[PDB]
Design a protein around this ligand. Structure first.
Ligand code: HEM
Ligand code: HEM
Ligand SMILES: C[C@H](O)[C@H](O)[C@H]1CNC2=NC(N)=NC(=O)C2=N1
Ligand SMILES: C[C@H](O)[C@H](O)[C@H]1CNC2=NC(N)=NC(=O)C2=N1
Ligand SMILES: N=C(NO)NCCC[C@H](N)C(=O)O
Ligand SMILES: N=C(NO)NCCC[C@H](N)C(=O)O
Ligand SMILES: [Zn+2]
Lengths: 420, 420
């Protein structure tokens, strides 16, 4: 009937009905839970060689139209009926169909609403949609991407936005951004055995090199857009520095902090995901909301596989660096987080601390259960990388499932690409 | 064939073969992940009215004996064969069977090894086993429990231990400890609308009252053992104060910290779980290892549903208590954690910080994959309530599954008890 969910903090109880509408199989099995897996197939939508089977497309298309029309307060029945007819007619005449701008907007918001790994979902109804469904060249993609970066940025006062490129036709003409995110730093395997910049973008930095990119050998070298249009070989495009807004890090107390020469871009823009809606798939639809301090302060700066600044941030604080039990890492990371927050707040760049975000998400959950009887949620991703139980989301039991529309991962393009 | 697992910190990859031996269905479904659920049925072993069906018992029994005998370096084949025969003969003659002390020891260690929610598992081969399988009265249980508390405590130098009471016969003669843990503080719904002590033990404190316990109305009132033997009504037994070792909290800097009048018992002893092994079940088998600072500092002291000391610990630190973004909670909790650590370390009471534990568990995982091709792990429980990504376990993908022997939860006794 429904799954009983409890919040161990408030004692409140919710009943999940929404999970019943879940698509197909998920990450876990009958005798195992694999909720810990980063990139499971259930969260991935791969390549294709042929168009989508009509028998599969049609039902999916009708389901979406019924969802879309059952959305407004006083349902426009005559239009609802008319759209169902027009979409079917389009499918049997063209082998596919086009969404109305309105439906796209609904789709991108609902897919965001359906992102189980996003804590910012209370903002789901505030999203700018850029319709680049008529794009055809790499140069045009690059232009659309620039307009996105410029709009989203809004000179620090971040605005959530997404740009949709042409939907996958037969799978051999896919528009793809080879970048992880719109703005990302390079990583170099320097001569002295070390690694400069962002070690996460190592393999991709080389790819950019092999494609003729000019390695600036540094720590914060904004990588170039690697765009593939209409299935052609990817073209390298350098991002105009004027567009890339960064925030130099400075502690409100430790004046020695800026001597680290640390900064980070103000724009969190996922670039390699796929939007699935009503049987259609858009393999190129970069999007962004705003940052949560912990992503930068904790993950980007402190991960062993990323910048790895903990060792020296502890030293410069005078902490017992060679004694784990002293909890130095705990003291450092906290200061790096207030620095990140402080910095953004000083330079007027929108940001959100993990505590405030968790509280708003909790309110979002409540609004959601009351509204549609559920909220797909991935606890492992929703709970901040620090201050776990200090956060309200930690004490909230949740169900994780894939609905539709949805935002899927994709197989890295260089692994499946055709080199002509 | 096997599930591929990766550690995003080191880049290392492991192959899980162990999950194939998993018992039955787990928490999650085919289209949903419920790994976030605290007390799912898959982790619970309920009551019974009749003995265990022979057809079920026998295979389980044989599987365990084969596991046990396939354990020593140079297998004692003749004895292996002989035990298989003797156990079958015992099952068909008595309707059940008894484990040898050796098998019990192996069973309790393996079950611990199989606890997916325990980060301390590198210590799995160091465990004292108290055989109280011949116990028959509530008074005898109480005595055994006292000997356990005394041994485990060892005057601060904690030793892992478990005491096994009589196995479930027909299910109407169960030995059960109604307490959550051996040592636990009372919670009172005081006159002025507040709540004193440990709010988690509220409903149970009243139960103790209804049974004639003398409410001492305080904050750290060690609750009484509520023991049910041979299926009879539970008898109240007050724990001898001399046995209950506590640690008064004091910060190595903030001398005003002890003015809070804070302390906590040094003995983490789970009292209400059930041991399942070779088809048998022991519904009474309290156990303990040692504490991880975060359990006390973060959960016990800082949870909204527990002590809830954050508000004033922040105040006394001078932090911006009415501004979430200031990250005060982060600064406070860290100090409470070093206090807890410091205190235990000063009073010579064994304890472990979350960073050191995570590193040892990681080593345990490695030893385990190489040894038996896997390690059941619940990421959601294994990752500390603070410092998530600062910890190595956060970056380690893991599989969660139920093996055998195992430690199961049970339905709270007062909900199913027969009152004669
Ligand atoms: C309004 C501000 C928003 C905030 C603060 C926010 C915050 C976050 C955070 C903390 C994550 C985790 C990132 C990581 O750990 O790598 C995340 C993930 C995600 N967010 Fe949001 N988000 C916001 C807006 C959006 C928007 C506009 C969309 C899409 C329309 C979105 C889609 C997603 C998706 C699909 C993921 C998963 C990414 C992945 O799996 O790698 N978010 N978001
Ligand atoms: C040697 C020191 C040990 C340490 C530091 C350790 C630590 C921990 C921690 C942090 C938890 C989580 C507790 C909570 O969040 O409520 C836990 C859970 C658990 N541990 Fe260990 N442990 C140790 C020894 C043992 C032993 C001796 C056993 C059993 C023989 C054991 C069995 C378990 C089980 C089954 C759980 C799950 C409890 C539950 O689900 O509520 N541990 N342990
Ligand atoms: C192994 C484990 O799945 C990864 O380390 C996780 C855990 N949870 C996470 N949560 C979030 N928000 N981002 C992550 O990258 C992330 N990675
Ligand atoms: C809702 C969620 O399952 C609970 O808040 C969790 C999460 N992880 C946890 N981890 C540990 N170690 N102990 C817990 O009680 C705990 N509870
Ligand atoms: N807040 C968002 N989206 O709105 N984050 C998207 C992923 C960004 C990534 N975690 C980073 O730190 O770069
Ligand atoms: N470390 C252990 N076991 O060895 N903990 C068991 C649970 C104790 C519980 N988390 C508490 O803080 O009281
Ligand atoms: Zn699962």
């Amino acid at each position: 009937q429904y799954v009983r969910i409890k919040n161990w903090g408030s004692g409140e109880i919710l009943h999940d009905t929404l999970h019943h509408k879940a698509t197909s199989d998920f990450t876990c099995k009958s005798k195992s839970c694999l909720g810990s897996i980063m990139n499971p197939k259930s969260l991935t939508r791969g390549p294709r060689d042929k168009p989508t089977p009509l028998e599969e497309l049609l039902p999916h298309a009708i389901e979406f139209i019924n969802q879309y029309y059952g959305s407004f307060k006083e349902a426009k029945i005559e239009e609802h009926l008319a759209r169902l007819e027009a979409v079917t007619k389009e499918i049997e005449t063209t082998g596919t169909y086009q969404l109305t701008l309105d439906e796209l907007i609904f789709a991108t918001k609902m897919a965001w609403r359906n992102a189980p790994r996003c804590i910012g979902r209370i903002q789901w109804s505030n999203l700018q949609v850029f319709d680049a469904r008529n794009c055809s060249t790499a140069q045009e993609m690059f232009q659309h991407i620039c307009r996105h970066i410029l709009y989203a940025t809004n000179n620090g006062n971040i605005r959530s936005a997404i740009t949709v490129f042409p939907q996958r036709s037969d799978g051999k003409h896919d528009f793809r951004l080879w970048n992880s995110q719109l703005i990302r730093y390079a990583g170099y395997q320097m001569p002295d055995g070390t690694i400069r910049g962002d070690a996460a973008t190592l393999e991709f930095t080389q790819l950019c090199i092999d494609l003729g990119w000019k390695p600036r050998y540094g720590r914060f070298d904004v990588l170039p857009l690697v765009l593939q249009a209409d299935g052609q070989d990817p073209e390298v495009f350098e991002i105009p520095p004027d567009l890339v807004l960064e925030v130099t890090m400075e502690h409100p107390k430790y004046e020695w902090f800026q001597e680290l020469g640390l900064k980070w871009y103000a724009l969190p823009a996922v670039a390699n995901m796929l939007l699935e809606v009503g049987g259609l798939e858009f393999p190129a639809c970069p999007f962004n909301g705003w940052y949560m301090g912990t992503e930068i302060g904790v993950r980007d700066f402190c991960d062993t596989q990323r910048y790895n600044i903990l060792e020296e941030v502890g030293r410069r604080m005078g902490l017992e660096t060679h004694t784990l039990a002293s909890l130095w890492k705990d003291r450092a990371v906290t200061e790096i987080n207030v620095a990140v927050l402080h910095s953004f707040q000083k330079q007027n760049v929108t940001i959100m601390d993990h505590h405030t975000a968790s509280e708003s998400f909790m309110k979002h959950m409540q609004n959601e259960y009351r509204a549609r009887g559920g909220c797909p949620a991935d606890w492992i991703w929703l709970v901040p990388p620090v201050s776990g139980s200090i956060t309200p989301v930690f004490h909230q039991e949740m169900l994780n499932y894939v609905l539709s529309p949805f935002y899927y991962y994709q197989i890295e393009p260089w692994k499946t690409h055709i080199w002509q």
